[PDB]
């Protein structure tokens with residue numbers, strides 16, 4: 001066709017959501033997407049739905065159930081005689097969910113009147129977007145507003161190049177039709193920890209090599225310390241400050257050479273996952289004179305409203321600054337669709353939660369204790385273990401703790417941090433608190449259901465100021 | 473000893489908490505409790521901890537895991553060859569938690585400086601409490617304030633009198649060393665539903681006889697309809713409007729005679745649980761001239777601050793008006809202790825959440841739809857199924873829905889109702905919403921982590937006003 005109010009490039013969380021919101025606001029919207037899926041046709045949903053968020057979660061769940069049936073069922077008096085996992089079958093279920101969701105956002109699109117275009121899209125000058133279709137047929141849409149949501153891709157690293165299915169990335173890790181007897185991960189970050197956990201739960205001997213001396217440096221020190229202790233005890237041999245120098249694939253194995261503190265070591269995995277990072281994709285996206293700028297690291301340059309250097313053009317999700325997380329991309333999506341339609345939506349970057357779906361699950365929102373100490377903030381902190389949780393004890397899951405940090409001067413809750421059962425939900429409660437300004441005492445005065453895990457949020461807010469009923 | 477600032481009668485949730493708060497507030501406090509536990513010595517914690525909240529939660533978890541292992545493990549490619557449950561060992565694990573919690577609050581008490589007294593306590597005139605010790609030895613404490621937390625107990629009913637281990641109550645049901653082949657529950661309310669689920673999950677054939685025509689009449693109609701559907705499908709033969717006329721224990725079985733709409737039927741269970749209700753215990757609690765009043769139903773009469781008819785005497789939890797829920801008791805416990813120390817603590821009775829721990833879990837806070845319709849409130853409502861949940865799909869748990877109700881005029885969220893995975897924490901996020909006054913749009917403009925069950929709360933809030941991203 002020729003004219004549209006919004007032309008969205010990318011159909012991941014930032015893009016499909018932005019497209020769906022602008023459509024609901026009444027903008028004639030078209031979205032361009034080229035990912036040829038898993039059954040030959042284009043798949044909407046991007047990284048999160050295809051190779052990200054939904055597949056890694058589904059594997060983490062099935063591997064966990066497997067783990068519980070083998071390690072934690074006897075305390076309930078449940079003896080499963082010889083339980084096994086069929087990794088193909090597992091992976092199929094994952095495939096399936098992906099298939100069904102992919103389909104779901106297509107119907108969502110049609111239901112909302114979104115004109116989908118299959119092909120690579122590129123922003124030319126004067127906001128025309130050249131949709132190089134799939135079959136070579138090229139086309140030029142004229143757009144009143146352009147929303148770029150091209151996304152991000154794995155960092156490739158020289159010492160470990162993706163060689164076949166031996167040195168593989170996020171995606172390949174999600175695809176093993178069998179358990180690597182020994183497995184190495186380079187990067188002890190969210191994706192490393194999670195892909196690590198999956199295969200380790202099913203019998204893989206995992207070593208996670210990570211170049212930095214600090215485990216999880218964005219999580220709170222206390223949660224970090226706790227996380228690491230738990231995960232190593234869970235089976236992941238995490239080696240900090242180990243720098244990879246070389247790979248050598250040979251006889252269906254690869255040998256990583258690395259220097260940690262006592263120099264060079266070499267270890268031989270059957271599979272090696274490079275989970276070092278992700279980088280914005282700006283590949284054939286911008287014509288030489290589009291007007292759009294990039295910063296030094298490859299991110300498209302945007303302000304706080306995701307407006308680019310050219311008016312009418314906005315950039316969101318993993319190609320622009322911010323935390324590379326699904327819900328940041330969709331909310332930017334919405335901020336941007338909302339603004340195009342005329343509402344002055346603002347996006348609160350201080351409250352994006354972070355969750356790591358390990359079991360126990362790490363999650364957090366707000367500032368970390370150390371940020372606050374380095375910022376010279378005197379804070380009161382309350383903690384509450386899941387071990388004093390009656391609900392946790394019925395549940396037989398008592399690892400972890402909640403931690404609330406509050407300004408010592410005002411009693412404003414500054415950050416809520418938890419590792420343990422339902423961390424995501426418990427921090428979400430704190431985020432809702434925080435969004436409206438809770439103090440520890442405000443959280444304290446509320447009625448939390450008994451028995452529930454939410455109560456550990458309760459007790460630790462109480463604890464910020466001395467009065468936790470069930471501890472001191 | 474002789475003089476105390478607070479003397480607390482009963483060490484349930486209301487009692488022990490109030491005792492611990494008073495102690496922290498600086499009052500010389502003593503608490504009296506007579507429940508001879510499971511190992512011969514007195515057990516602190518009350519109904520909730522000894523035959524209530526924790527024991528029923530722990531069987532519900534062990535029975536659930538057995539059920540998952542037998543019915544929903546294969547879709548993950550897990551095959552447990554022949555899984556069995558050792559009911560003895562199951563029950564023992566429960567026994568254990570209780571033991572460990574019982575002991576926990578004793579240390580909590582000692583840690584706080586709480587003088588425990590073992591024996592029956594009776595409030596004489598002029599606030600002196602007569603501790604009839606355990607060994608006949610009577611004693612009189614003189615109390616500046618007295619907090620009565622005597623609790624509640626199973627309603628007994630004539631046509632089904634507790635006969636041996638055949639017609640049993642909440643407590644005996646939590647004690648079965650084996651699965652009743654066929655099992656009847658009289659009462660299709662929280663404790664009925666939960667004890668039913670436990671034995672049904674492990675093979676019991678359950679019939680739940682309930683005299684009213686309305687299932688879960690306090691729960692929102694939609695959730696009730698949904699709940700019922702799910703629970704019958706889960707195996708509980710719930711028969712509404714059926715009135716029990718007679719029991720007849722014979723050859724280790726009992727035959728209940730009942731009239732529903734097509735008259736009399738008789739059904740023969742191996743075990744019968746009477747879970748018709750609970751009533752306040754005021755037994756030899758009040759000396760004829762204490763000054764303390766009872767209403768018509770047995771409840772001690774109190775106002776909004778739990779002040780009785782005689783100044784300096786307060787009543788809390790199941791002996792007074794309100795919902796018979798452990799968190800209602802504990803918070804009254806704290807309100808009361810807080811006020812005796814000089815703070816004007818108020819208790820919000822509008823926000824007490826309700827949770828039924830079936831799987832899926834029902835839970836709610838705020839007004840139901842029909843309350844609001846009968847009150848002539850025009851409300852917008854938003855719903856969001858767990859089937860559109862990515863996280864729920866990964867989890868393989870998609871039954872259920874969320875429901876937010878909002879005033880149509882102001883957009884204030886009036887009630888959050890959910891049946892499904894994590895209902896409790898989802899409503900606890902709503903409750904925090906509600907305590908600070910969220911409108912649906914305020915819930916909507918917040919960043920909820922992706923993928924999480926919490927998101928279903930986010931979506932249905934959106935949906936209250938038209939814009940739910942992942943549905944219409």
Ligand SMILES: Cc1cc2nc3c(=O)[nH]c(=O)nc-3n(C[C@H](O)[C@H](O)[C@H](O)COP(=O)(O)OP(=O)(O)OC[C@H]3O[C@@H](n4cnc5c(N)ncnc54)[C@H](O)[C@@H]3O)c2cc1C
Nearest residue numbers: 010012013014046047048052053121151317318324325326
């Ligand atoms: C293993 C893994 C697990 C993850 N799990 C989570 C998680 O659980 N929670 C979380 O929040 N984050 C998670 N993330 C990250 C999350 O997926 C990303 O943050 C998020 O998907 C970024 O969304 P986006 O819309 O910016 O980009 P993407 O999802 O990368 O989508 C971009 C889309 O644009 C398309 N495209 C690009 N250029 C063009 C073009 N020029 N024309 C047409 N089409 C084009 C791409 O094909 C793609 O479909 C995970 C990442 C990985 C790899």
Ligand SMILES: Cc1cc2nc3c(=O)[nH]c(=O)nc-3n(C[C@H](O)[C@H](O)[C@H](O)COP(=O)(O)OP(=O)(O)OC[C@H]3O[C@@H](n4cnc5c(N)ncnc54)[C@H](O)[C@@H]3O)c2cc1C
Nearest residue numbers: 482484485486518519520524525593623789790796797798
């Ligand atoms: C099977 C079951 C499950 C339940 N599950 C939950 C749940 O999961 N969530 C929820 O919120 N509620 C639940 N409840 C209800 C919950 O137990 C009650 O709401 C709550 O315990 C009431 O607290 P209380 O302190 O008022 O009374 P109680 O727990 O009954 O405590 C009263 C105490 O006072 C003692 N006592 C009585 N008189 C005297 C006397 N004169 N002198 C000395 N001591 C005395 C008694 O021995 C007892 O220890 C459940 C009930 C049952 C039966």
